[PDB]
Design a protein around this ligand. Structure first.
Ligand SMILES: NCc1cccc(Cn2nnc(-c3onc(O)c3C[C@H](N)C(=O)O)n2)c1
Ligand SMILES: [Li+]
Ligand SMILES: [Li+]
Lengths: 259, 258
């Protein structure tokens, strides 16, 4: 029977093709995770349907209702069979779903406008002339809120009290703010997205410094699902064969615009 | 019952302390994996004994007998409960033991003696004057043996047929061979070791090229062991607390001797 894949629309992982109206089913979509899903399914021998998570969320547990939202919730409550998406392997998710070993590494990173005199998170933390912030929701904000590391705690105290607000509602708003702020705004985001935007016209942003943390995206299945073992072996095989590196190069650099 | 940990003496992961003869038990040892074992045990609530892998190997399967050696074999055959070491997560190992999610990243890299005219794996693959090889019974040799990537497949065909043997029995033997071979041996090893050695006396080796692949070290348990779930959650918690980053920065700290 057909495996129900839950995923989320986010470039370059999953995108509707420009001509999607002329296409059907899974062929309407393209991107890194679309290609990854096809490779996993081929190695594991299943057919599948790509579905887009209803609530547009990755997966968190509401503190009041204790209900899991997002792709994680679709797995937890038995509505999907597998999630193939930029879904970070975290402790609280690992407690409730199964994850493959990571298919992609990432960490929180600094996006600057080219020419900005910042080389590290330490550099940002010691000044205020260049404002800096994060998405107003989600894991990067939460990283700073929860960190007990001195530099990141300092950054959080700065971010919470800075005026005008250094937070943005969307990735696009953060990128636009970097681009329009003449070097006076830096945006903190996942290194994978930072690298992607560095390859978008007009080629005026860059990733600077080392990453602030390290984590991985994993393929998720309901806890105890028989599919989990085969999927994990497939991730390891695709990595060893160089296919994961090929797919990253395809969607970030071969299709990049900045050389 | 006290959990039997298998590990391998590899600086800066596990090292006998300078004054180990004055110490006993787990306190004889220091290093990243010694610290990590203590943190995992505290979070999972077990007592443990650090033991050193009997055959000094990481682990591979003999193609004729199908017997696993190294730390992998100690888990497969019931000699240890957990391996806490720079043990690379690989497909063939995952089939026979359980792994946590990775606690540290690495990739295959190239170590040369300073001045060797090699800048990349492609450079190595196109010549034979500078011999090159890797560690027996490790994940790098298995990577090359199995690889269908053109450059790496060519490198494996070269390594199999090179004379004298380009393979080494320990990581220390690989570095010693680089150092003594007057520029005529390059060693394929993981980036963690390459970078650590480059920054220490006698300052005569360096890493060249980008990493050839991207993988991770994992905490390993026998397949199906009940310890695996708790250990994996502990790894993720330590990651999210920044403790793994702290340990890495401490044990790879560059004192500036090179
Ligand atoms: N004391 C120097 C030192 C410093 C830092 C790290 C290490 C550990 N280590 N580094 N490289 C390797 C290694 O290289 N090829 C292999 O096959 C392995 C083994 C591989 N990890 C496996 O699991 O088989 N193992 C040693
Ligand atoms: Li899990
Ligand atoms: Li990390």
């Amino acid at each position: 029977k057909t495996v129900v894949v839950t995923t989320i629309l986010e470039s370059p992982y999953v995108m509707m093709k420009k001509n999607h109206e002329m296409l059907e089913g899974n062929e309407r979509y393209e991107g890194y995770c679309v290609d990854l899903a096809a490779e996993i399914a081929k190695h594991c021998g299943f057919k599948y349907k790509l579905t887009i998570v209803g609530d547009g969320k990755y997966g968190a547990r509401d503190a009041d209702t204790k209900i899991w939202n997002g792709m994680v919730g679709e797995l937890v409550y038995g509505k999907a069979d597998i999630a193939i998406a930029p879904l970070t392997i975290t402790l609280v998710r690992e407690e409730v779903i199964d994850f493959s070993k990571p298919f992609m590494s990432l960490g929180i990173s600094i996006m600057i406008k080219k020419g900005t005199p910042i080389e590290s998170a330490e550099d940002l933390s010691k000044q205020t002339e260049i404002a800096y912030g994060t998405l107003d929701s989600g894991s990067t904000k939460e990283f700073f809120r929860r960190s007990k590391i001195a530099v990141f705690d300092k950054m959080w105290t700065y971010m919470r009290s800075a005026e005008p607000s250094v937070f943005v509602r969307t990735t696009a708003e953060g990128v636009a703010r970097v681009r329009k702020s003449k070097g006076k705004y830096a945006y903190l985001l996942e290194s994978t997205m930072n690298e992607y935007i560095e390859q978008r016209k007009p080629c005026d942003t860059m990733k600077v410094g080392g990453n602030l943390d390290s984590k991985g995206y994993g393929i998720a299945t309901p806890k105890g699902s028989s599919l989990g073992n085969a999927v994990n072996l497939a991730v390891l095989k695709l990595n060893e064969q160089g296919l994961l590196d090929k797919l990253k190069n395809k969607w970030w650099y071969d299709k990049g615009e900045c050389g």
